[PDB]
Design a protein around this ligand. Structure first.
Ligand code: PJ5
Ligand code: ZN
Length: 773
């Protein structure tokens, strides 16, 4: 009787704000893409003639088709949000091209993976050769086809396309046939390969059709090794690839939702709970101040953020896009699950933190371009995509992000409206005969006004979110005072027979806070209200800040600044917090007026506004007592680590999917794993990469474990490396570096590196491959 609903994008008009800017910039980027290049893989796999070459980058190195899927979703949501005619022409054309591809094969299959029909013939026969990122020699093909399922779902739900609906059902029936001869054990083996959110999309088809066969399919596509610990409130996520898991959990939640009234299956509450526990553990233990998670795409231990503070590959944007999708699902029925009948605004505090500080920051606001990694290492920078060069996962999610800022501003519950986000907007609440405008300069000002533009004098309750970070309201010039009931996130209820012209005004008091890195190392970020602040540390060596189509072009490969050159805050955390002063002006800006080492007064602005520069979000802190020892470590060990990084020509992390894929991983009889938080690969046959040599290289460094008795032969362009390596002292965790001084410098270009056993059963387990000048 008390279900909470969301509004359609059609019903929520963004008014001038950073969000409308971001929407419009993404519109331009979406329209820049050539649909004939995005459709080319699909036509190819159907036996038709493409009209143009595919894009390059990931669209011709094995993930061919994935951006086309995202492109359907982004066009559909952007069309719902704007009604843009150019967007509709592109969406109609892409749907009709993919429909031609589907009809040419006639089975329901649509896809771009090279050799798609052969792949799925093998799978259907039970020839399943799964790795974490591969299936039968192909790059995450389940993940790829997921973006088509999702794209066709979105064309139906957002753009009302019946053609998309039929294409989606045919493609789902095709998968029923592919999996009809597979045991649950074979399915769970195949699901070891990254598969995006297929369980979610199959549950979506169940709801669209009302046919439970699609819910049985969704459950078959639910990865049990991940689900089962979550049911039991066990976080087993250390070392896992993070964006692989989040869509699975979204899927468990969606299966639970669509299964709410399924008399033949009794697990909905358990699967809902698994998702709510997953959210809790990631948000509360694995997330930084901007709302993101992971380092080099993987979950590190929650008690050790060292790599988050040292690596240039900070949180990945996809992961936050997916955590926000989950957040929206969990919030909707939070009141049903806790039998309060009011949803839990703690979900909204997270949503706001991640939306303003990560999603909004992840697009260059003027020109466009999407961020993959956001370093938390002080003094680095982030790289942006370009429309015709960049075909990354974070481009696909990037296209979607800025279409849909209207989706979570408000929620409705019969005669109740939840005012969740303080984003300028006009709402059509047709269910209660109301049109309302939210006017605010937030976060640059504290005042919010809600204006009733149209109403039918129903008694309605406005539930205004009072964030934990933030009671007098004004109605029509009259002050109404209410008692604070909790310092926690809560709602302030205001019920009236609203009429045209009524005005509700409230203020959100904003304070400076200082948020420590979660493992309580000596690094802190400044916030103002929910806004993460940052300082610009310079504009030198921003190499590849607008990416080309190269493998690895999503990473900020420019020079690493030694930490002793970046401002370090001297003193205790309360003194440091008190030393940040707000500057006068209509935009947020702050001066840091305490002691900084080395001296440059620092200016801080919102991180979402900091572009085309190096930055610090987290600052290293030093007590006056520990300064001498801290500075000596920064001047010696940290400086030397930075020098090694700055002599590095190429770098591979064996066992990490994207580093391996960017270096054209090949293998025979190989396995991967983790030891002491580091990934490896080893083989009984062999494994190989291509090294990309931008500058001549002199030295190869291989990281292994001292205790490993297995040895590798190394071939460079099929010539055995016979020079004797120098061997480093073992570190704390038992890792050593083998340093080979190459007999001849390696030429600029590409060089195969191949590892095969040297008399032993396996190669050494290799944890890092580094090429140096
Ligand atoms: C980016 C994102 O993490 C996706 O899940 C993955 O397939 C891609 C590269 O690893
Ligand atoms: Zn990504």
């Amino acid at each position: 009787n008390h279900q909470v609903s969301y509004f359609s994008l059609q019903d929520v008009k963004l008014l001038s704000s950073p969000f409308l800017q971001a929407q419009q910039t993404d519109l331009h980027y979406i329209l820049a893409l050539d649909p004939d290049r995005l459709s080319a893989p699909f036509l190819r796999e159907a036996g038709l003639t493409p009209k143009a070459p595919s894009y390059t980058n990931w669209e011709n190195t094995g993930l061919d088709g994935h951006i086309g899927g995202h492109y359907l979703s982004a066009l559909s949501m952007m069309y719902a949000a704007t009604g843009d005619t150019a967007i509709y022409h592109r969406l109609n054309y892409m749907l009709n091209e993919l429909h031609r591809a589907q009809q040419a094969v006639g089975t329901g299959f649509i896809g771009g993976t090279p050799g798609s029909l052969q792949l799925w013939k093998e799978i259907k026969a039970g020839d399943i050769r799964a790795g974490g990122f591969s299936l039968n020699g192909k790059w995450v093909p389940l993940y790829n086809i997921h973006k088509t399922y999702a794209g066709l779902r979105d064309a139906y739900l957002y753009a009302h396309s019946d053609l998309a609906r039929q294409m989606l059902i045919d493609l789902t029936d095709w998968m029923i046939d592919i999996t009809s001869g597979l045991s649950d054990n074979q399915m769970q083996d195949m699901l070891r390969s990254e598969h995006g959110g297929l369980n979610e999309t199959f549950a979506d088809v169940a709801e669209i059709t009302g046919d439970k066969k699609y819910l049985k399919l969704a459950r078959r596509f639910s990865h049990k090794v991940i689900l089962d610990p979550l049911i039991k409130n066990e976080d087993r996520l250390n070392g896992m690839h993070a964006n692989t898991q989040i869509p699975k959990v979204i899927g468990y939640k969606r299966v639970a939702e669509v299964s709410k009234n399924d008399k033949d299956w009794n697990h909905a509450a358990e699967w809902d709970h698994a998702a709510r526990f997953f959210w809790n553990t990631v948000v509360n233990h694995r997330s930084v101040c901007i709302g993101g998670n992971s380092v080099r795409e993987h979950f590190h231990p929650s008690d050790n953020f060292t790599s988050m503070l040292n690596d240039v590959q900070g949180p990945e944007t996809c992961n936050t896009y997916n955590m926000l999708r989950l957040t929206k699902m969990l919030y909707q029925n939070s009141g049903d699950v806790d039998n309060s009948n009011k949803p839990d605004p703690r979900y909204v505090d997270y949503y706001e933190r991640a939306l303003y500080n990560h999603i909004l920051s992840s697009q260059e606001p003027d020109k466009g371009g999407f961020v993959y990694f956001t370093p938390m290492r002080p003094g680095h920078y982030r790289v942006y995509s370009q429309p015709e060069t960049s075909m990354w996962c974070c481009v696909g999610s990037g296209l979607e992000n800025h279409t849909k800022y209207g989706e979570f501003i408000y929620a409705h519950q019969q005669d109740t409206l939840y005012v969740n986000l303080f984003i300028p907007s006009q709402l059509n609440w047709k269910e209660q005969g109301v049109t309302l405008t939210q006017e605010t300069l937030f976060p640059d000002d504290e005042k919010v006004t809600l204006r009733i533009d149209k109403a039918a004098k129903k008694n309605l309750t406005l539930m205004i979110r009072i964030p934990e970070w933030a009671y007098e309201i004004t109605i029509n010039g009259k002050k109404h005072l209410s008692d604070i009931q909790t310092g926690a996130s809560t709602y302030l209820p205001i019920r009236r027979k609203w009429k045209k012209g009524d005005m509700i005004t409230f203020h959100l008091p904003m304070k400076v806070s200082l948020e420590q890195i979660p493992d309580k190392k000596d690094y802190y970020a400044f916030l103002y209200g929910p806004i993460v602040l940052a300082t610009s540390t310079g504009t030198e060596n921003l190499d590849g800040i607008y990416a080309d189509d190269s493998r690895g072009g999503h990473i900020a490969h420019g020079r690493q600044t030694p930490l002793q050159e970046i401002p370090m805050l001297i003193g205790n955390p309360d003194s440091i917090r008190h030393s940040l002063h707000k500057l006068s002006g209509s935009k947020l800006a702050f001066s840091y007026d305490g002691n900084v080492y080395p001296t440059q007064s620092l200016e801080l602005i919102p991180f979402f506004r900091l572009h085309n520069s190096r930055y610090a979000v987290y600052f290293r802190q030093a007590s006056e007592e520990q300064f001498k020892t801290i500075q000596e470590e920064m001047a010696t060990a940290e400086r030397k680590a930075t020098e090694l990084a700055n002599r590095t020509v190429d770098l591979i992390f064996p066992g990490e999917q994207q580093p391996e894929s960017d270096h054209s991983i090949q293998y025979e009889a190989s396995e991967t794993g983790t030891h002491k938080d580091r990934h490896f690969r080893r083989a009984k046959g062999w494994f190989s990469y291509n090294l990309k040599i931008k500058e001549e290289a002199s030295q190869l460094m291989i990281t292994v474990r001292q205790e490993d008795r297995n040895k590798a032969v190394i071939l460079l362009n099929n010539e055995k490396l016979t020079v004797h390596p120098t061997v480093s002292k073992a570190d704390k965790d038992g890792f050593i570096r083998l340093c080979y001084l190459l007999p001849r410098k390696l030429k600029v270009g590409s060089c195969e590196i191949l590892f095969k056993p040297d008399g032993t059963e396996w190669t050494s387990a290799v944890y890092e491959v580094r090429l140096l000048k």
